[PDB]
Amino acid sequence: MASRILLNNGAKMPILGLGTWKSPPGQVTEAVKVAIDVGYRHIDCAHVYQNENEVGVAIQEKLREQVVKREELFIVSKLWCTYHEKGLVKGACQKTLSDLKLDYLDLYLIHWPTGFKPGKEFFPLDESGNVVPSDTNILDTWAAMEELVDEGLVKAIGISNFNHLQVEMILNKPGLKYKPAVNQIECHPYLTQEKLIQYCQSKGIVVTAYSPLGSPDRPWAKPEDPSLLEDPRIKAIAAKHNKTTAQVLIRFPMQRNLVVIPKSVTPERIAENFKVFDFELSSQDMTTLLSYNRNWRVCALLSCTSHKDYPFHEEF
Numbered sequence: 627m628a629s630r631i632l633l634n635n636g637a638k639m640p641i642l643g644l645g646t647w648k649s650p651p652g653q654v655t656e657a658v659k660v661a662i663d664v665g666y667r668h669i670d671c672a673h674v675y676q677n678e679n680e681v682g683v684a685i686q687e688k689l690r691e692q693v694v695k696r697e698e699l700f701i702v703s704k705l706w707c708t709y710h711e712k713g714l715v716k717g718a719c720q721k722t723l724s725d726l727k728l729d730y731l732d733l734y735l736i737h738w739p740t741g742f743k744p745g746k747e748f749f750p751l752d753e754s755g756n757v758v759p760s761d762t763n764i765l766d767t768w769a770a771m772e773e774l775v776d777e778g779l780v781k782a783i784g785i786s787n788f789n790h791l792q793v794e795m796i797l798n799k800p801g802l803k804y805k806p807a808v809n810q811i812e813c814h815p816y817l818t819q820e821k822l823i824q825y826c827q828s829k830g831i832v833v834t835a836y837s838p839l840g841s842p843d844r845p846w847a848k849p850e851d852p853s854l855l856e857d858p859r860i861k862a863i864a865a866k867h868n869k870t871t872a873q874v875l876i877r878f879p880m881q882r883n884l885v886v887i888p889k890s891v892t893p894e895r896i897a898e899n900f901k902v903f904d905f906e907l908s909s910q911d912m913t914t915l916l917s918y919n920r921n922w923r924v925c926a927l928l929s930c931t932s933h934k935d936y937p938f939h940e941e942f
């Protein structure tokens with residue numbers, strides 16, 4: 627299948643990208659170097675991941691080695707929750723650019739629809755464990771995102787973890803200048819997102835599936851939580867194709883016309899994860915994987931469930 631998907635700005639976005647959350651600064655430079663060598667062009671980043679410097683080191687080295695040119699790369703980052711104020715947006719984007727050593731991003735996302743109290747702390751909590759919000763709203767933050775495109779800092783803007791009503795809010799904004807190009811959402815066999823995907827795709831919004839392997843390294847995991855990579859039913863599908871479970875889990879969203887961004891810092895896995903253009907999941911496989919849905923979110927926090935813009939009260 628084609629390796630890129632057309633965005634609403636006429637640019638093409640590689641459907642397979644490298645995730646970088648939890649890729650430690652001490653190990654991510656090599657991860658990104660290897661990724662580039664074996665063919666990844668899309669890298670998913672974020673200021674909150676606190677490793678954009680080191681990702682930037684890897685990109686700079688591969689540009690200088692003449693392994694890739696800037697135009698071939700598709701670099702994504704995200705505006706963190708503590709920078710939703712219209713006056714903070716450009717500075718946040720420029721810090722990301724400075725750290726990545728880039729002069730533009732291919733795509734910049736609102737990381738979560740929620741604004742958090744501005745300050746040094748990424749996750750300000752109050753004495754009883756609830757996040758401290760900011761008095762910002764989706765539409766004003768979007769307007770600030772639009773300014774970034776008009777200033778040439780970013781080629782496309784989008785959103786992440788927005789429910790369909792929050793997407794609709796942007797789409798219905800009087801004087802909207804740019805539609806969101808992408809909604810990046812959690813998506814895998816345990817959370818198949820049929821309704822939000824159908825909604826987004828019907829609105830001309832490209833969907834990126836995050837945590838496609840089930841984010842086994844997430845810091846709030848419980849030992850009794852369901853584990854995708856270890857699911858015997860998926861291992862069986864993989865063995866049938868002489869592929870790994872991870873390869874099946876990456877190919878799955880690709881065949882749903884989604885972009886997918888598996889994370890690894892392990893060079894062997896980074897290479898393995900990219901080798902998913904040489905097989906196809908059958909109808910039956912696709913159906914079987916979809917049937918494993920349990921509306922189970924690996925990326926959601928109790929501490930945010932009182933925020934006025936918490937996205938997961940809605941069905942989708």
Ligand SMILES: NC(=O)c1ccc[n+]([C@@H]2O[C@H](COP(=O)([O-])OP(=O)(O)OC[C@H]3O[C@@H](n4cnc5c(N)ncnc54)[C@H](OP(=O)(O)O)[C@@H]3O)[C@@H](O)[C@H]2O)c1
Nearest residue numbers: 645646647836837838839840841843872888889890891892
């Ligand atoms: N927008 C958002 O709110 C949001 C939320 C979550 C994630 N994301 C993005 O999506 C990316 C991917 O999601 P994720 O990081 O949550 O988790 P994921 O990609 O579902 O899983 C990554 C985990 O799987 C392991 N792994 C990778 N390849 C493997 C393989 N072939 N075999 C066995 N294990 C393998 C990794 O180990 P090693 O790295 O140790 O090899 C790591 O522990 C993130 O890094 C981030 O870029 C965005």
Ligand SMILES: N#Cc1ccc(CNC(=O)c2ccc(Cl)cc2OCC(=O)O)cc1[N+](=O)[O-]
Nearest residue numbers: 647674675738740925926927930931933936937
């Ligand atoms: N609102 C909200 C909200 C915010 C965050 C989360 C979960 N994410 C994190 O706790 C997180 C924290 C630090 C880092 Cl570096 C990465 C993280 O996740 C990966 C990512 O967000 O990309 C959940 C919610 N929420 O409303 O459910």
